[PDB]
Write a protein that binds this ligand. Structure first.
Ligand SMILES: *C/C=C(\C)CC/C=C(\C)CCC=C(C)C
Lengths: 149, 5
């Protein structure tokens, strides 16, 4: 429980305040959430406008609070399609000061247009699985089912 | 590494 008690302490003190997806070419926010999708043990749902599939790049912005210090806060994200892994991403934030609020921005580039999946094939069939870690320590795993509308 | 979305 030693590492498990610490993971629980971090999770209990951790909150996603807000998150945005922004078209990096226009600067326009496409999608905004205020729900804490770090919360495990529930299948979250998100509806995103299907025009996100035509973006060359999307700026992802997350604002999070952490009571607990983290040495090397990072995310692993798997994109599952009808239960099959299509892409896996790794994002590193690094040191988190205890009881800080933090904005974390990442630019996610689109595959060439010819490789992008159609909205009608994707919608309802995509799960994003996010593992939140401090270094080696798994703090939380959350799942979000994506609809393209 | 690019996304397919
Ligand atoms: C095209 C779709 C993208 C860029 C991913 C959508 C993801 C979410 C909405 C939420 C998943 C991420 C976190 C919980 C940080």
């Amino acid at each position: 429980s030693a590492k498990d008690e610490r993971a629980r302490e971090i999770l209990r003190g951790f909150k996603l305040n807000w998150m945005n997806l922004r078209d990096a070419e226009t600067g326009k926010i496409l999608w905004q959430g205020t729900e804490d999708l770090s919360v495990p043990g529930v299948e979250h749902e998100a509806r995103v406008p299907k025009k996100i599939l035509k973006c060359k790049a999307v700026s992802r912005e997350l604002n999070f609070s952490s009571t607990e210090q983290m040495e090397k806060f990072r995310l692993e994200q798997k994109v599952y399609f009808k239960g099959q892994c299509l892409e896996e991403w790794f994002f590193e934030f690094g040191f988190v000061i205890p009881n800080s609020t933090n904005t974390w921005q990442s630019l996610i580039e689109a595959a060439p247009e010819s490789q992008m999946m159609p909205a009608s094939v994707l919608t309802g069939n995509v799960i994003i699985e996010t593992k939140f870690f401090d270094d080696d320590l798994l703090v939380s795993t959350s799942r979000v089912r994506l609809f393209y509308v | 590494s690019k996304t397919k979305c």
